[PDB]
Amino acid sequence: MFPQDFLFGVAMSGFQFEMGKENSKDENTDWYIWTHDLQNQANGVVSRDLVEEGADYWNSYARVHELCSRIGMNVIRIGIEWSRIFPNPTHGIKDPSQIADMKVVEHYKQIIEDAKSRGLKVIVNLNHFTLPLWLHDPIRVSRFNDFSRSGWLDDRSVHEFTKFATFCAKSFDDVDAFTTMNEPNVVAKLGYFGRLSGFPPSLLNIDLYEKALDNQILAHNKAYETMKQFTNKPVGIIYATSWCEGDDARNDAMELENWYFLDRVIDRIDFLGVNYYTRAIVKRTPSVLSSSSGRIKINWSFVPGFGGSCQRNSKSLDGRPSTDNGWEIYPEGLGYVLRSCRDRYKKPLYVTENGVADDRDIYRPYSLLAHLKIVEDCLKENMDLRGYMHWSIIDNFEWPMGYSMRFGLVRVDFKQKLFTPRPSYYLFGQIINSRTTEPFLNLLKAWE
Amino acid sequence: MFPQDFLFGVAMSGFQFEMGKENSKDENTDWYIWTHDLQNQANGVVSRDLVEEGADYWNSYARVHELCSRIGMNVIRIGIEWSRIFPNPTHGIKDPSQIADMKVVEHYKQIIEDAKSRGLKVIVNLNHFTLPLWLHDPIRVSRFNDFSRSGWLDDRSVHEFTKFATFCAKSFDDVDAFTTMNEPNVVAKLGYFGRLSGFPPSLLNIDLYEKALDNQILAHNKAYETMKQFTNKPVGIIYATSWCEGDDARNDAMELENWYFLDRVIDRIDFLGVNYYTRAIVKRTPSVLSSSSGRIKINWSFVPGFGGSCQRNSKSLDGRPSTDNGWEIYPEGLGYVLRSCRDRYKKPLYVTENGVADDRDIYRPYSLLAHLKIVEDCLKENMDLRGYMHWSIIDNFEWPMGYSMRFGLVRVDFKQKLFTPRPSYYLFGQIINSRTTEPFLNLLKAWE
């Protein structure tokens, strides 16, 4: 049985969920201008969907929180938008509290208290990909070689993030926990070394990938140190943990994908949030690619037909189902990643994201149950694993894919602003009620 | 909303559900010896699955009834086995009540009373394909041209069924309703004019098809008359209603598939149970096939790639999904069938079966919701439609396919005798509790 202290819940971000009515429109991020760029759209780099026609969590948060509490979840992780809290640059302002948008801060405090009043512990994540436009204009970077506002490449970013973190630890006194950032390794790798992924600014330069990783490491460490001076609540980080299999090059792949960053922040976190979706198959390359510093080294490639590289709504080359976005269902990898984190680090663990793109709900019941069974296996091994948070409660804006990729336990009709739970939502409630997957395991036999 | 007295429930049969424990084993049917025949098995005519290793409804009926009532179902239809009640032939015995197996009768009364005590109305169906071995030995018929026990070909079968019906009407005085038989048109067509279907005795002779139809008509009409002398409860029939589309031969096909039989029993039923799974597409043939009597004329063929003739787990030629047994999901056909029964007859209607073969539960949520939406459309047209029963609550023995086709809202692990609800089960409960499909309809957009 899952301990009754165990947290069952969901994860959300600001940008992908908040917008949808005019009173919440936030044009002030790199991602907003990135997705409205017509040249990007014409090249298929981003979709034509409008984030400002989305799910309206900014005003409908009470409906969303009630969906969570109705099936007994007891935690939610939300993102707050730096671009809303500090709409104007803070450089040169030692104490920026007088230029924070307090209407925005009050609104987030109202969202937090509403969730808490429904029995949800609230984890507030300070940064989830998007950056204030005054800090990052990715079209100026991408198309005009203009680095005056260059995001995590920018020499102001670490300092300005620390100031933002200090303000949040002081002002958001009633959260249950903080995390500084969400998958910083994805921001860096997809932004500067993932040209086919469509993440801003879509540069292709291993040295900038290295710079963005290292500035986010610095930003996290300094943020933890300042926030711990002003809050008693736990402060962690959320990381996109890969699980690489293949020839002997697995170890080098895992070092760059996971352990390089995590080794350098582990001393400055109270818990580690693990985001896991699928595995990756690697094989050694004939040549070594090294950064100019010699500090980053790449000598593997990712093998197509497995993990994130499958055909949509198909099977991997190992015969496992692949979802609406072509990601293989590989539940054992979640246990392998968590055991690696336990072996390397003495640190409480949470699964902070796990889910599937699946509008018809033909993958999510199986994937949810199979991954929770793996989580229960880890608990039986006495691993210090304290919660599981699904991505997500509702369909939302899936970065360059727009609304086409639907991750919710609950379907959203974005035009009619309607929420409709899928059957996997009711199954999650039943698993939470039983506090074990044991009465449900026979369903898994239909997939073997 | 669905009317307050509308019935939501499930349908079962004796042979497909009861056995599983040694104390319930019934070797006294045509279907038992048909499925145990090694030559049939070697030819792929029937599977090698054992009905006597099944779901054990005979002893586990309380568990099955509780699955229904915990979701708020309020009806169940169960089959009684003639072969258990009268294990020995009744010919020449006026009043065979002295040779009925009263321990069997008492056991069925216990099953019925358990369902009633949980809030389920009970419809008892007197015949569901299987016949006593003393009435029908299909191996003697098919392999040895021996018609001494020839089932519905036997002039004798009508009289002995009348006696059985009389005994049941007198004995089972706590049921809510009776039906005489279940899809008699399928027994006749697949038994004597459906050589590839695997149904006993697998003859191929249009004149014996005609004779089996006519004798089941006689048996129903006689049974109704005798039963109504001894019970005030409604007595109906359950019919496999085809929905034929295609060229102008569709009207001839509908006449033989549906109205030939139903026209001849309509004045002797209190309600019509409509069993519907998918549509059929027909096209005129160059030649006319006539029975020797001239009463049956066939001038159409069934077009492959639609309805019951799709590839498994695929799509029809119209792009609609097909399930584990290759049956197209065509929910509009249920409304077309019901409206044509409404137009042709003045008779209360029930949907007595509807479901899908689907172990993974990837089709049933969609199919359940879509067909219930069609039912709700018919209710808005003020049609005298009084209930919907899904096939079925649990996985069971699917005639010549054995256990390989799983129709349950609830998965059965037959070896461990374990029941595990699929997510469509919880969705059904939510729809029943809402008393309308309207809050769920947006789920259908994922399937276009």
mmCIF file of C-alpha atoms in Angstrom, chain A residues 16-317:
data_model
loop_
_atom_site.group_PDB
_atom_site.id
_atom_site.type_symbol
_atom_site.label_atom_id
_atom_site.label_comp_id
_atom_site.label_asym_id
_atom_site.label_seq_id
_atom_site.Cartn_x
_atom_site.Cartn_y
_atom_site.Cartn_z
ATOM 1 C CA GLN A 16 0.558 26.396 -21.256
ATOM 2 C CA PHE A 17 -2.575 26.810 -19.109
ATOM 3 C CA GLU A 18 -3.288 30.383 -17.975
ATOM 4 C CA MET A 19 -4.313 32.273 -21.075
ATOM 5 C CA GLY A 20 -7.668 32.100 -22.829
ATOM 6 C CA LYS A 21 -9.550 35.261 -21.904
ATOM 7 C CA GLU A 22 -8.459 38.790 -22.690
ATOM 8 C CA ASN A 23 -7.915 39.823 -19.046
ATOM 9 C CA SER A 24 -5.045 37.305 -18.717
ATOM 10 C CA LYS A 25 -3.231 37.938 -22.010
ATOM 11 C CA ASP A 26 0.542 37.986 -21.424
ATOM 12 C CA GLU A 27 2.406 39.095 -24.557
ATOM 13 C CA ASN A 28 5.588 39.622 -22.512
ATOM 14 C CA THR A 29 7.495 36.312 -23.002
ATOM 15 C CA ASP A 30 9.997 34.875 -25.435
ATOM 16 C CA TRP A 31 7.554 32.019 -26.115
ATOM 17 C CA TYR A 32 4.649 34.360 -26.934
ATOM 18 C CA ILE A 33 6.575 36.177 -29.653
ATOM 19 C CA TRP A 34 8.194 32.881 -30.771
ATOM 20 C CA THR A 35 4.809 31.250 -31.463
ATOM 21 C CA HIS A 36 3.260 34.351 -33.077
ATOM 22 C CA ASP A 37 6.120 34.672 -35.586
ATOM 23 C CA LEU A 38 4.678 34.101 -39.069
ATOM 24 C CA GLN A 39 7.979 32.955 -40.570
ATOM 25 C CA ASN A 40 8.315 30.266 -37.876
ATOM 26 C CA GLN A 41 4.735 29.209 -38.646
ATOM 27 C CA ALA A 42 5.317 29.062 -42.408
ATOM 28 C CA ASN A 43 8.349 26.826 -41.812
ATOM 29 C CA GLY A 44 6.420 24.490 -39.509
ATOM 30 C CA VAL A 45 8.724 25.437 -36.637
ATOM 31 C CA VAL A 46 5.705 26.278 -34.427
ATOM 32 C CA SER A 47 2.018 25.602 -34.937
ATOM 33 C CA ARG A 48 -0.568 28.235 -35.818
ATOM 34 C CA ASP A 49 -2.498 27.695 -32.560
ATOM 35 C CA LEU A 50 -2.907 30.702 -30.264
ATOM 36 C CA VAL A 51 -1.861 30.323 -26.624
ATOM 37 C CA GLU A 52 -4.259 33.173 -25.840
ATOM 38 C CA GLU A 53 -7.189 30.944 -26.921
ATOM 39 C CA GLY A 54 -6.322 28.280 -24.335
ATOM 40 C CA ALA A 55 -7.729 26.706 -21.197
ATOM 41 C CA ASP A 56 -8.184 29.904 -19.082
ATOM 42 C CA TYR A 57 -6.651 28.569 -15.858
ATOM 43 C CA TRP A 58 -6.092 32.232 -14.915
ATOM 44 C CA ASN A 59 -9.841 32.617 -14.292
ATOM 45 C CA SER A 60 -11.013 28.975 -14.121
ATOM 46 C CA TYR A 61 -8.526 27.729 -11.517
ATOM 47 C CA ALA A 62 -11.311 26.809 -9.069
ATOM 48 C CA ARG A 63 -12.846 24.420 -11.625
ATOM 49 C CA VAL A 64 -9.426 22.870 -12.279
ATOM 50 C CA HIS A 65 -8.635 22.470 -8.574
ATOM 51 C CA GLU A 66 -12.068 20.911 -7.982
ATOM 52 C CA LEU A 67 -11.373 18.313 -10.679
ATOM 53 C CA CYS A 68 -8.282 17.352 -8.658
ATOM 54 C CA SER A 69 -9.855 17.239 -5.219
ATOM 55 C CA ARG A 70 -12.956 15.361 -6.441
ATOM 56 C CA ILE A 71 -10.863 12.235 -7.111
ATOM 57 C CA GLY A 72 -8.878 12.699 -3.909
ATOM 58 C CA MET A 73 -5.606 14.082 -5.069
ATOM 59 C CA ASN A 74 -3.678 15.965 -2.394
ATOM 60 C CA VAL A 75 -1.003 17.914 -4.314
ATOM 61 C CA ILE A 76 -0.725 20.231 -7.301
ATOM 62 C CA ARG A 77 2.362 21.856 -8.831
ATOM 63 C CA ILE A 78 1.782 25.165 -10.622
ATOM 64 C CA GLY A 79 4.087 27.573 -12.409
ATOM 65 C CA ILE A 80 4.248 31.301 -11.842
ATOM 66 C CA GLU A 81 5.274 33.525 -14.733
ATOM 67 C CA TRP A 82 8.306 35.771 -14.125
ATOM 68 C CA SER A 83 7.007 37.791 -17.106
ATOM 69 C CA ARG A 84 3.790 38.649 -15.212
ATOM 70 C CA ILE A 85 5.347 39.296 -11.766
ATOM 71 C CA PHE A 86 8.079 41.588 -13.184
ATOM 72 C CA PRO A 87 6.728 42.958 -16.486
ATOM 73 C CA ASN A 88 9.623 45.467 -16.675
ATOM 74 C CA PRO A 89 13.380 44.862 -16.390
ATOM 75 C CA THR A 90 14.850 44.761 -12.892
ATOM 76 C CA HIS A 91 18.501 45.367 -13.825
ATOM 77 C CA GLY A 92 20.077 48.061 -11.662
ATOM 78 C CA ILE A 93 17.231 47.929 -9.115
ATOM 79 C CA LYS A 94 18.556 46.338 -5.933
ATOM 80 C CA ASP A 95 15.107 45.826 -4.339
ATOM 81 C CA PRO A 96 12.550 45.421 -7.169
ATOM 82 C CA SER A 97 9.509 44.924 -4.924
ATOM 83 C CA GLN A 98 8.164 48.379 -5.852
ATOM 84 C CA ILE A 99 8.071 47.463 -9.562
ATOM 85 C CA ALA A 100 6.500 44.015 -9.134
ATOM 86 C CA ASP A 101 2.935 43.772 -10.437
ATOM 87 C CA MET A 102 1.116 43.257 -7.103
ATOM 88 C CA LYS A 103 -2.228 42.650 -8.848
ATOM 89 C CA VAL A 104 -0.506 39.616 -10.399
ATOM 90 C CA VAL A 105 1.042 38.538 -7.073
ATOM 91 C CA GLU A 106 -2.335 38.855 -5.327
ATOM 92 C CA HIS A 107 -3.935 36.774 -8.079
ATOM 93 C CA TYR A 108 -1.395 33.958 -7.671
ATOM 94 C CA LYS A 109 -1.913 34.038 -3.894
ATOM 95 C CA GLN A 110 -5.655 33.643 -4.551
ATOM 96 C CA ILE A 111 -4.960 30.628 -6.797
ATOM 97 C CA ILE A 112 -2.687 29.095 -4.129
ATOM 98 C CA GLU A 113 -5.222 29.586 -1.312
ATOM 99 C CA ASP A 114 -8.031 28.145 -3.430
ATOM 100 C CA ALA A 115 -6.049 24.955 -4.086
ATOM 101 C CA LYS A 116 -5.095 24.685 -0.395
ATOM 102 C CA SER A 117 -8.739 25.094 0.652
ATOM 103 C CA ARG A 118 -9.558 21.957 -1.369
ATOM 104 C CA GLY A 119 -6.931 19.838 0.408
ATOM 105 C CA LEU A 120 -4.172 20.190 -2.205
ATOM 106 C CA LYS A 121 -0.641 20.904 -1.049
ATOM 107 C CA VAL A 122 0.811 23.479 -3.437
ATOM 108 C CA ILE A 123 4.260 23.326 -5.025
ATOM 109 C CA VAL A 124 5.086 26.608 -6.775
ATOM 110 C CA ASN A 125 7.658 26.390 -9.568
ATOM 111 C CA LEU A 126 9.387 29.678 -10.311
ATOM 112 C CA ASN A 127 10.370 29.088 -13.938
ATOM 113 C CA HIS A 128 8.944 26.810 -16.632
ATOM 114 C CA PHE A 129 10.730 27.550 -19.947
ATOM 115 C CA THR A 130 9.328 31.020 -20.625
ATOM 116 C CA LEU A 131 11.365 34.155 -19.908
ATOM 117 C CA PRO A 132 10.345 37.832 -19.768
ATOM 118 C CA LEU A 133 10.636 39.447 -23.183
ATOM 119 C CA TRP A 134 12.898 42.113 -21.653
ATOM 120 C CA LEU A 135 15.338 39.279 -20.880
ATOM 121 C CA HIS A 136 14.965 37.150 -24.043
ATOM 122 C CA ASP A 137 13.798 38.152 -27.512
ATOM 123 C CA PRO A 138 14.402 34.932 -29.479
ATOM 124 C CA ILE A 139 13.512 36.418 -32.863
ATOM 125 C CA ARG A 140 16.180 39.123 -32.469
ATOM 126 C CA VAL A 141 18.598 36.350 -31.456
ATOM 127 C CA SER A 142 17.514 33.892 -34.161
ATOM 128 C CA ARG A 143 16.970 36.106 -37.190
ATOM 129 C CA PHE A 144 19.046 39.266 -36.600
ATOM 130 C CA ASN A 145 22.059 37.941 -34.635
ATOM 131 C CA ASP A 146 21.059 40.393 -31.878
ATOM 132 C CA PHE A 147 22.063 39.103 -28.423
ATOM 133 C CA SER A 148 21.143 42.234 -26.457
ATOM 134 C CA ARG A 149 18.285 40.185 -24.858
ATOM 135 C CA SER A 150 19.645 36.642 -25.055
ATOM 136 C CA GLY A 151 17.938 34.766 -22.212
ATOM 137 C CA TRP A 152 20.077 32.218 -20.377
ATOM 138 C CA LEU A 153 23.002 33.314 -22.561
ATOM 139 C CA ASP A 154 22.610 36.830 -21.116
ATOM 140 C CA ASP A 155 25.053 38.067 -18.522
ATOM 141 C CA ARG A 156 22.170 39.577 -16.530
ATOM 142 C CA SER A 157 20.065 36.406 -16.375
ATOM 143 C CA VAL A 158 21.632 34.756 -13.313
ATOM 144 C CA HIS A 159 21.474 37.949 -11.231
ATOM 145 C CA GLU A 160 17.976 38.901 -12.329
ATOM 146 C CA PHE A 161 16.668 35.372 -11.650
ATOM 147 C CA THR A 162 18.176 35.451 -8.138
ATOM 148 C CA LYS A 163 16.354 38.728 -7.475
ATOM 149 C CA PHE A 164 13.099 37.184 -8.744
ATOM 150 C CA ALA A 165 13.621 34.125 -6.520
ATOM 151 C CA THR A 166 14.287 36.292 -3.456
ATOM 152 C CA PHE A 167 11.042 38.181 -4.056
ATOM 153 C CA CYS A 168 9.041 34.952 -4.434
ATOM 154 C CA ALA A 169 10.420 33.356 -1.267
ATOM 155 C CA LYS A 170 9.469 36.498 0.682
ATOM 156 C CA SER A 171 6.051 37.138 -0.852
ATOM 157 C CA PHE A 172 4.627 33.628 -1.407
ATOM 158 C CA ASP A 173 4.607 32.752 2.270
ATOM 159 C CA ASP A 174 1.824 30.141 2.156
ATOM 160 C CA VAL A 175 2.991 27.611 -0.462
ATOM 161 C CA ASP A 176 3.906 24.125 0.678
ATOM 162 C CA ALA A 177 7.131 23.951 -1.354
ATOM 163 C CA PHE A 178 9.054 25.692 -4.135
ATOM 164 C CA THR A 179 11.055 24.539 -7.115
ATOM 165 C CA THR A 180 13.386 26.977 -8.871
ATOM 166 C CA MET A 181 12.996 25.686 -12.425
ATOM 167 C CA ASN A 182 11.479 22.986 -14.626
ATOM 168 C CA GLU A 183 13.678 20.881 -16.951
ATOM 169 C CA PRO A 184 16.481 23.470 -17.362
ATOM 170 C CA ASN A 185 18.379 20.853 -19.398
ATOM 171 C CA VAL A 186 15.563 20.865 -21.985
ATOM 172 C CA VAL A 187 15.600 24.674 -22.204
ATOM 173 C CA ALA A 188 19.332 24.547 -22.907
ATOM 174 C CA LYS A 189 19.494 21.497 -25.173
ATOM 175 C CA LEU A 190 16.405 22.246 -27.276
ATOM 176 C CA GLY A 191 17.084 25.990 -27.457
ATOM 177 C CA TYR A 192 20.721 25.749 -28.617
ATOM 178 C CA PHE A 193 21.283 22.172 -29.792
ATOM 179 C CA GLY A 194 17.905 20.837 -30.913
ATOM 180 C CA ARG A 195 17.221 22.534 -34.220
ATOM 181 C CA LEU A 196 14.393 20.164 -35.203
ATOM 182 C CA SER A 197 12.595 20.575 -31.861
ATOM 183 C CA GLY A 198 11.228 24.120 -32.465
ATOM 184 C CA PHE A 199 12.300 25.544 -29.063
ATOM 185 C CA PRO A 200 13.509 29.212 -28.989
ATOM 186 C CA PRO A 201 15.894 30.619 -30.095
ATOM 187 C CA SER A 202 16.591 27.452 -32.214
ATOM 188 C CA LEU A 203 20.347 28.070 -32.453
ATOM 189 C CA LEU A 204 22.684 25.181 -33.304
ATOM 190 C CA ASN A 205 25.909 25.650 -31.324
ATOM 191 C CA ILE A 206 27.251 23.228 -28.718
ATOM 192 C CA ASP A 207 29.080 26.117 -27.004
ATOM 193 C CA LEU A 208 25.809 28.001 -26.425
ATOM 194 C CA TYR A 209 24.155 24.805 -25.199
ATOM 195 C CA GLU A 210 27.005 24.595 -22.676
ATOM 196 C CA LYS A 211 26.630 28.254 -21.709
ATOM 197 C CA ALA A 212 22.861 27.982 -21.131
ATOM 198 C CA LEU A 213 23.284 24.840 -19.011
ATOM 199 C CA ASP A 214 25.932 26.522 -16.875
ATOM 200 C CA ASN A 215 24.048 29.804 -16.376
ATOM 201 C CA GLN A 216 20.987 27.838 -15.254
ATOM 202 C CA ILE A 217 23.159 25.851 -12.806
ATOM 203 C CA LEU A 218 24.466 29.147 -11.386
ATOM 204 C CA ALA A 219 20.987 30.671 -11.295
ATOM 205 C CA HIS A 220 19.584 27.663 -9.427
ATOM 206 C CA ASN A 221 22.391 27.537 -6.815
ATOM 207 C CA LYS A 222 22.205 31.278 -6.040
ATOM 208 C CA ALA A 223 18.383 31.189 -5.985
ATOM 209 C CA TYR A 224 18.360 28.301 -3.457
ATOM 210 C CA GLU A 225 20.810 30.164 -1.153
ATOM 211 C CA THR A 226 18.784 33.422 -1.176
ATOM 212 C CA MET A 227 15.382 31.750 -0.883
ATOM 213 C CA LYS A 228 16.451 29.604 2.078
ATOM 214 C CA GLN A 229 17.240 32.850 3.914
ATOM 215 C CA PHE A 230 13.602 33.930 3.695
ATOM 216 C CA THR A 231 11.495 30.769 3.696
ATOM 217 C CA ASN A 232 11.259 27.655 5.834
ATOM 218 C CA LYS A 233 9.581 25.695 3.050
ATOM 219 C CA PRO A 234 11.469 23.036 1.045
ATOM 220 C CA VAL A 235 13.101 24.294 -2.152
ATOM 221 C CA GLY A 236 13.856 21.789 -4.901
ATOM 222 C CA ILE A 237 14.348 21.488 -8.662
ATOM 223 C CA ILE A 238 12.498 19.634 -11.434
ATOM 224 C CA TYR A 239 14.628 17.790 -13.981
ATOM 225 C CA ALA A 240 13.929 15.962 -17.252
ATOM 226 C CA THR A 241 15.655 12.650 -16.529
ATOM 227 C CA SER A 242 16.441 10.555 -19.576
ATOM 228 C CA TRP A 243 16.818 6.786 -19.442
ATOM 229 C CA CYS A 244 19.344 5.741 -22.113
ATOM 230 C CA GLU A 245 19.882 2.147 -23.192
ATOM 231 C CA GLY A 246 22.176 0.760 -25.883
ATOM 232 C CA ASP A 247 25.878 0.001 -26.298
ATOM 233 C CA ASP A 248 28.605 1.206 -23.919
ATOM 234 C CA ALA A 249 27.926 4.810 -24.976
ATOM 235 C CA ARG A 250 24.891 4.842 -22.577
ATOM 236 C CA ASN A 251 27.106 6.058 -19.753
ATOM 237 C CA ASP A 252 28.391 9.074 -21.659
ATOM 238 C CA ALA A 253 24.878 9.908 -22.850
ATOM 239 C CA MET A 254 23.502 9.737 -19.288
ATOM 240 C CA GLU A 255 26.343 11.957 -18.077
ATOM 241 C CA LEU A 256 25.403 14.791 -20.425
ATOM 242 C CA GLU A 257 21.640 14.232 -20.323
ATOM 243 C CA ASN A 258 21.315 13.879 -16.529
ATOM 244 C CA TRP A 259 24.304 13.793 -14.222
ATOM 245 C CA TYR A 260 26.349 16.782 -15.397
ATOM 246 C CA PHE A 261 23.618 19.216 -14.335
ATOM 247 C CA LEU A 262 22.296 17.251 -11.357
ATOM 248 C CA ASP A 263 25.783 16.710 -9.858
ATOM 249 C CA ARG A 264 26.213 20.506 -9.868
ATOM 250 C CA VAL A 265 22.893 21.389 -8.117
ATOM 251 C CA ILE A 266 22.351 18.340 -5.767
ATOM 252 C CA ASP A 267 24.015 20.109 -2.769
ATOM 253 C CA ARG A 268 21.479 22.971 -3.166
ATOM 254 C CA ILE A 269 18.084 21.167 -3.298
ATOM 255 C CA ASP A 270 15.790 19.800 -0.599
ATOM 256 C CA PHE A 271 14.188 17.302 -2.999
ATOM 257 C CA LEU A 272 14.500 16.227 -6.617
ATOM 258 C CA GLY A 273 11.533 16.211 -8.974
ATOM 259 C CA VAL A 274 11.913 13.632 -11.737
ATOM 260 C CA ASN A 275 10.081 14.180 -15.050
ATOM 261 C CA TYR A 276 9.952 10.967 -17.107
ATOM 262 C CA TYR A 277 8.072 10.154 -20.330
ATOM 263 C CA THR A 278 10.054 7.527 -22.273
ATOM 264 C CA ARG A 279 13.461 5.938 -22.856
ATOM 265 C CA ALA A 280 16.140 6.591 -25.475
ATOM 266 C CA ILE A 281 18.332 4.118 -27.381
ATOM 267 C CA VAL A 282 21.874 5.250 -28.114
ATOM 268 C CA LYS A 283 24.819 3.957 -30.059
ATOM 269 C CA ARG A 284 28.411 5.130 -30.283
ATOM 270 C CA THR A 285 29.350 7.465 -33.150
ATOM 271 C CA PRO A 286 32.608 7.126 -35.118
ATOM 272 C CA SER A 287 33.737 10.657 -34.195
ATOM 273 C CA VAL A 288 33.824 12.647 -30.975
ATOM 274 C CA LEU A 289 32.131 16.042 -30.965
ATOM 275 C CA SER A 290 33.534 18.351 -28.285
ATOM 276 C CA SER A 291 32.691 21.862 -27.240
ATOM 277 C CA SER A 292 35.377 24.559 -27.659
ATOM 278 C CA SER A 293 36.012 24.397 -23.837
ATOM 279 C CA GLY A 294 36.561 20.626 -24.138
ATOM 280 C CA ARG A 295 34.093 20.311 -21.210
ATOM 281 C CA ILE A 296 31.113 18.813 -23.193
ATOM 282 C CA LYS A 297 31.715 15.663 -25.270
ATOM 283 C CA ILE A 298 29.207 13.860 -27.526
ATOM 284 C CA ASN A 299 30.039 10.464 -29.030
ATOM 285 C CA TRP A 300 26.597 8.828 -29.328
ATOM 286 C CA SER A 301 23.527 9.117 -31.520
ATOM 287 C CA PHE A 302 19.895 8.353 -30.734
ATOM 288 C CA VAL A 303 18.545 5.276 -32.560
ATOM 289 C CA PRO A 304 15.215 5.875 -34.367
ATOM 290 C CA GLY A 305 12.222 3.624 -33.795
ATOM 291 C CA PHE A 306 12.458 3.700 -29.976
ATOM 292 C CA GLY A 307 11.613 6.039 -27.103
ATOM 293 C CA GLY A 308 10.848 9.557 -28.342
ATOM 294 C CA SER A 309 11.627 8.641 -31.957
ATOM 295 C CA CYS A 310 8.743 6.346 -32.904
ATOM 296 C CA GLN A 311 6.049 6.737 -35.504
ATOM 297 C CA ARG A 312 2.848 8.306 -34.203
ATOM 298 C CA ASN A 313 0.099 5.920 -33.003
ATOM 299 C CA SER A 314 2.177 2.898 -33.879
ATOM 300 C CA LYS A 315 4.661 0.549 -32.221
ATOM 301 C CA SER A 316 8.336 0.858 -31.448
ATOM 302 C CA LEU A 317 10.755 -1.643 -33.000
#
